Structure formats: structure tokens, C-alpha cells
Swiss-Prot record:
Keyword annotations from UniProtKB, A to Z: Cell membrane, Cytoplasm, Developmental protein, Membrane
Protein location: Cytoplasm, Cytosol; Cell membrane
Function summary: Functions in planar polarity establishment and circadian rhythms by promoting the activity and localization of dco/dbt. Required for regulating the levels of dco/dbt and per in the nuclei of photoreceptor cells and thereby is involved in normal oscillations of the circadian clock proteins in the eye. In the dark, the cry circadian and rhodopsin visual pathways, activate the accumulation of the protein into Arr1- and Arr2-dependent cytosolic foci which are required for dco localization to photoreceptor nuclei.
GO BP terms, alphabetized: locomotor rhythm; regulation of establishment of planar polarity; regulation of intracellular protein transport; regulation of post-translational protein modification; regulation of protein catabolic process
Phenotype of gene-disrupted mutants: Lethal. RNAi-mediated knockdown in the wing disrupts cell polarity. RNAi-mediated knockdown in clock cells, results in behavioral arrhythmicity and long periods. RNAi-mediated knockdown in the eye disrupts oscillations in the subcellular localizations of per and dco, leading to constitutively nuclear per and constitutively cytosolic dco in photoreceptor cells.
Species for this entry: Drosophila melanogaster
GO MF entry, a single one: kinase activator activity
Record membrane topology: Peripheral membrane protein
Protein's UniProt name: Protein Bride of doubletime
Region of the whole protein represented: 2 to 211 of 286
Protein origin, superkingdom: Eukaryota
Principal location: cytoplasm
Subunit composition and interactions: Interacts with dco (via nuclear localization signal). Interacts with Ankrd49; interaction promotes the stability of both complex members.
An example Gene Ontology CC term for this record: cytosol
Amino acid sequence: DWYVGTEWEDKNRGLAKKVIGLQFTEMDKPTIISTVEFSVNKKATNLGGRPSKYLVSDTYPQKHSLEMGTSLTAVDCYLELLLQQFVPGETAACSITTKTGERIEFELKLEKIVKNTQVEKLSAAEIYEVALRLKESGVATFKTFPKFAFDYFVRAAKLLITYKPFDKLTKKTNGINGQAVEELFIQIQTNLAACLLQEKRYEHVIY
């Protein structure tokens, strides 16, 4: 065994991964816009009341379909980032450390990558739909997780400005009308503004 025991970290986000098993098929990793299938191998420990679509218990192991950039909770969003570090067939002990130092611990396996689209490949039309879905997740997490909501809108905005100017876009050439793009960009800018106000409203409310 070579891959077993190897480790990855993102100190900034309190994420750590340690490989415990591998059924090798290839060294491909999920992209930021991929669709994957993965399983939770046992009950997550120390969830501590935090909402999670995948880790929240109520039989193991259990399978899930996941499209990157759709998660609506803090834990789930960070689940995605861990999954983006798996190769298919890999089983890893994962952890999310909180501000209080307490660790949420879980064991995941990436079963396969259903679709591994690359951003660079995408047409302007397809980029729009990715920006549109990201904004939707932003809107859906606005009340419950404003920092993540914010990050969503930022990600959506960043995708779109790759096509500035917008005035040179036509359905005929790019697949999409440049008017639709600048309208969606403006909606996102407005959402980021709202988010900052939402964060202010609760900065002095304790966790």
C-alpha cells in the first residue's frame, strides 16, 4: 500500500483527510462543478446539533448523489471540499475542526465520479447556468449561513466576469444573450450587498 495513510489538510478551513483504503481505478479528482456518488461509512461523531443533509443521523454504509455547489449548510459545503480531494475508490477518515477546537469526525468513500466537467471547457451558455445555480444556493443559504451564501455569490460573480464585456455576447455566437448575463451579474451584486447587511445584523448575537 502506497496511498494508504497519506494525508491532506486545509488549515484555513480546519479540514483534514487521511486515506485508510483504496480501490484504485484512476487518479482523477472531482472538480468544483462535478457530480459524484459517495457513501458515509458510519455515524459521524461530534456533529453537535449542526444541520447536515449527509452526516445527520436518525444504516451504514449509505450512498448519496452529490452535485458540487448545491450544499445548503456549512458542514455539507465543507463536505464537498473534502470530496474534491478524493480519488474514486478511496476511503478516508475526515474531520472538520471548529473555532472551539472540537472535531466533527466522519468516514467517507468516493464511489465514483458521474460527471467531471471542467470550467475551462464550458461555453458562455453553460457558464451562465452554473452561475445561475450558484446564485440559487446563495439565495437558499442567505438566512441560515450568510458567509456561505456570500461565498456562493462571489463564486457565481467570478465565473461571469470571464466574459466581460457582456455587450459582445450573442445567442448566435456564444449560445446566450449578453443582456441575460449582465442582468444576472447585477442580481448577484445586489445579493452580496444584502449579505453584508445580513452579517452585520447578527455580528453581536452569540453562537
